[PDB]
Design a protein around this ligand. Structure first.
Ligand SMILES: [Mg+2]
Ligand SMILES: [Mg+2]
Ligand SMILES: [Zn+2]
Lengths: 95, 109, 125, 124, 234
RNA sequence: ACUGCUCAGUAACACGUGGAUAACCUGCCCUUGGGUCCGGCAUAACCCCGGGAAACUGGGGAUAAUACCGGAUAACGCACAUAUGCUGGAAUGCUUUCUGCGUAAAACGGAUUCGUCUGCCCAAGGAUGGGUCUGCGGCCUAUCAGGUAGUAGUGGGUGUAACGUACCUACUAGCCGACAACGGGUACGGGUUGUGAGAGCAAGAGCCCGGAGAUGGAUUCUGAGACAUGAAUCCAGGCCCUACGG
């Protein structure tokens, strides 16, 4: 599975990084944890800190849209991000 | 009220103590100005006025003159005659059907 | 309560068939007529928190001399006459445009007591 | 047969009593605000002022209304009415201050005190 | 106080997508016809917050200012020439009406800049005051030098007068309606044509024409005193 | 009182459209100009006893607030004199005003990092909401010819948020109609839709704008706003819970 990132705008009004990238996966659309693990090494973002909102794969060609995000605080994520995103994004040791 | 400026339609040579008289009274005339002729003036301070125009019909591509009656306020200083061209402008409702007051009643020539 | 909505035929006598009910904003109150008695008023409310003062009885007036422009409060004794109704003179009703009799002199009411909350009468010259 | 409720203002203590017979007939006709001898209660010189009541079917008496029978009232506030909406009027069934044989409960308060205690003068 | 997707105003550039209501603007100081929600502005134009909840959060935390006032409500109206200031990036934007009558945003350079208003009815508050029918900011209740339609300029956020931009023949003028919106040009003749509706005005910039006096803004002496046009960022 | 639903009534300033309100009201929101002054002290849950089939709901005891009441500095109406301030055919309004005559508000409330933030009253204006107003545009019908007396208008009033026969009074004798009044038939109006090469012809269920309606009907409280789809009241009409008193 392969990833290339294009847009990394940082919102000054919240102190978070907007991660936009193209998922050049092969065959099976990768899960959110796997895409987070791959996207972490591209910009030095921990799993608890790096957050992804969608890995949306298109028809036909094995290319997907990844709208990931980065925060300088997990409490900031819990204050801003929705609870379904926090559940959907597995924390270190999460259940 | 009685004020002279460009396109004033100035106040007549006769003073009127009417309360709804536009020049001497206290009625602010404002709205859409219109023109017509007195159908009959057998009613106090109110001259029934007719507006005649034409509406081109789309399908037949021809014309049809349309009549219409309006009740206007006829102040005593103006005193619009019978069958005379007159210009009316809107005012607040004087009566049950009176929202226009005549301002210039020119006897036809 | 009175209805002040637009209901009086059209122009001809064809009876207007109402398509709408008696709306709340078209409801007018009762003509609280004023007479010569102990000075009585009520703070009736109206739209938008505007409690209009309505007077009912009064035997005093704010007679206003025009010769010197001095306002002095003198008692009302009798309505001399009235143009509006020929019966309010007999009833001693105090409507605007009537003529009252005070201690200062004969005066004409120049204030609507049902809307003004006071009886302000101009002293006739 | 009146199920009278008597309260003590000096301690906020209410004693419920079941009364019958000649004393109950004496209570009949005593309007709200009446003072009644303690011999009807057996209390040693304890005078009680009647300040309430209700019907067998739960209709509450009104001290305002004069008359023993029932009446229909279109009220907007006051005794025995609670507006579900702000400033809402309703037509309830109320009672007068007159005491009737179809009246069960008689709320009342102790006013003119007696020699002995309030509790011990009713066997307690 | 709702408004639907289809009946969105003609001055609202945002499309007709979604589900019925699109962010009902408050009563506010400005007209509802030429107004956009600050939430809709920050969620569509600038793209700093995507959700309505996150937009309400960022507004409520004192992060966006409208002429120095950090409005916490996402339904605040915006009128023409309004400045939005964001200190964290030094992003300045001005409400402008393009050639089709729609409201857009042009980026400015400096954070600190004036705001332009106009005179609409000079009334007299009791106390010897010449009330100018002000609607936003602070101002000066002045004298008869301040006439109607004078198009005053005032600082931000203190809103003190910078320069009385009184109009005359030949002075600059910006259109605020019609088919000539945004075609700023010099005034040619301000004729006080007496009539029951309103008077008229002659204006010619790149091309000459006749325009209505309620569709003219006295936006400068000869050149733009305010930062009129910066960068048209969507 | 915003949405939401319905499409009976309505052939109508209801509606589309252009103006008007200098004839008006506006809680929330908006900017500037001010102010935020003394007090009084009930009644809640709670305590003690219940009544009631239920619906409901009584008494005595304790007490608080941005609750509620009473007092001082405005607005409102009369009469005045005072300079273009808007708009401008255009004061009739704002008014510099002050004059005297009747004539008023608020919660120095709450929180804090004591930085400040948000609330109360007030004046002017805006905006928002809505009432009113009129030029014009759009059905079938003569096997529907006269219709109209508050009907048409004047003066003075009354009530209204406000103009108004909207109501009342004195008076005038008008008003609409044969270029279709009045009546019957039918219908939620328009944006539009159907169809055809087009001229037209036919329908305007759904999406948006405005209108009306809440079983039929009348009446009313509350509120800035209603005669309220989840308010009441009664009548008609049907139905329903009952310990038969409701
Ligand atoms: Mg009328
Ligand atoms: Mg009211
Ligand atoms: Zn005249």
């Amino acid at each position: 599975m392969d990833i290339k990132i294009l847009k990394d705008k940082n919102n000054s009004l919240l102190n978070r990084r907007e991660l936009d990238f193209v998922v050049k996966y092969e065959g099976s659309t990768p899960s959110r944890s796997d895409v987070r693990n791959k996207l972490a090494a591209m910009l030095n973002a921990p799993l608890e800190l790096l957050i992804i909102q969608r890995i949306k794969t298109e028809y036909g060609m094995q290319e997907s849209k990844g709208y990931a995000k980065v925060y300088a605080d997990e409490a900031r994520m819990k204050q801003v991000e929705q609870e379904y995103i926090l559940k959907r994004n597995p924390a270190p040791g999460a259940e | 009220m009685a004020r002279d400026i460009g396109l004033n339609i100035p106040a007549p040579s006769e003073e009127c103590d009417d309360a709804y008289c536009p020049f001497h009274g206290t009625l602010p005339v404002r709205g859409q100005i219109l023109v017509g002729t007195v159908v009959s003036s057998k009613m106090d301070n109110t001259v029934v006025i007719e507006r005649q125009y034409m509406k081109m019909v789309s399908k037949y591509q021809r014309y049809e003159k349309r009549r219409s009656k309006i009740h206007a306020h006829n102040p005593a200083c103006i005193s619009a005659k019978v069958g005379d061209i007159v210009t009316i402008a809107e005012c607040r409702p004087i009566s049950k059907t009176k929202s226009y007051v005549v301002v210039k009643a020119e006897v036809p020539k | 309560m009175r209805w002040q909505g637009s209901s009086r035929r059209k122009a001809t006598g064809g009876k207007v068939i109402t398509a709408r009910g008696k709306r709340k904003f078209e409801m007018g109150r009762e003509s609280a007529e004023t007479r010569i008695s102990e000075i009585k008023r009520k703070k009736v409310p109206t739209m938008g928190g505007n409690r209009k003062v309505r007077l009912l009885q009064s035997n005093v007036a704010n007679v206003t001399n025009p010769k010197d422009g001095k306002t002095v409060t003198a008692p009302i004794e009798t309505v001399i006459d009235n143009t509006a109704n020929k019966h309010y003179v007999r009833r001693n009703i105090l409507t605007k445009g009537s003529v009252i009799r005070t201690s200062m002199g004969t005066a004409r009411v120049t204030s609507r007591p049902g809307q003004d909350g006071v009886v302000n009468a101009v002293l006739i010259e | 047969n009146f199920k009278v409720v008597v309260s003590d203002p000096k301690e906020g203590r209410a004693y419920q009593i079941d009364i019958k017979d000649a004393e109950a007939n004496a209570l009949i006709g005593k309007a709200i605000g009446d003072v009644v001898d303690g011999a009807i209660f057996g209390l040693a010189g304890y005078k009680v002022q009647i300040t309430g009541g209700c019907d067998g079917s739960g209709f509450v008496m009104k001290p305002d209304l004069p008359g023993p029978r029932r009446q229909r009232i279109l009220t907007a506030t006051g005794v025995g009415y609670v507006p579900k909406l702000p400033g809402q009027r309703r037509r309830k069934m109320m009672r007068g201050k007159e005491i009737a044989p179809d009246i069960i409960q008689v709320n009342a308060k102790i006013v003119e005190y007696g020699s002995k205690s309030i509790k011990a003068l009713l066997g307690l | 106080t709702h408004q639907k997707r289809l009946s969105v105003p003609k001055s609202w550039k945002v499309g007709k997508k979604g589900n019925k209501w699109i962010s009902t603007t408050r009563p506010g100081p400005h007209s509802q016809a030429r107004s956009l929600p600050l939430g809709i502005i920050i969620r569509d134009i600038l793209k700093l917050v995507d959700n309505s909840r996150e937009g309400k959060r960022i507004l409520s935390e004192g992060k966006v200012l409208v002429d120095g006032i950090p409005r916490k409500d996402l339904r605040f109206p915006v009128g023409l020439f309004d400045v939005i200031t964001l200190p964290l990036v030094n992003e300045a934007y001005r409400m402008l009406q393009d050639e089709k009558g729609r409201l857009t945003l042009h980026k400015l350079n400096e954070t600190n800049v004036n705001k332009l208003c106009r005179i609409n009815n000079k009334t007299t508050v009791k106390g010897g005051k010449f009330q100018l029918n002000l609607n936003d900011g602070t101002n000066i209740i002045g004298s008869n030098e301040y006439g109607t339609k004078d198009s005053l300029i005032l600082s931000i956020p203190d809103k003190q007068v910078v320069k009385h931009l009184k109009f005359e023949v030949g002075n600059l003028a910006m259109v605020v309606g019609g088919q000539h919106s945004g075609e700023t040009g010099k005034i040619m003749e301000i004729r006080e044509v007496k009539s029951s509706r309103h008077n008229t005005v002659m204006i010619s910039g790149e091309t000459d024409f006749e325009t209505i006096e309620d569709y003219v803004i006295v936006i400068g002496e000869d050149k733009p005193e305010i930062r009129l046009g910066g960068e048209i960022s969507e």
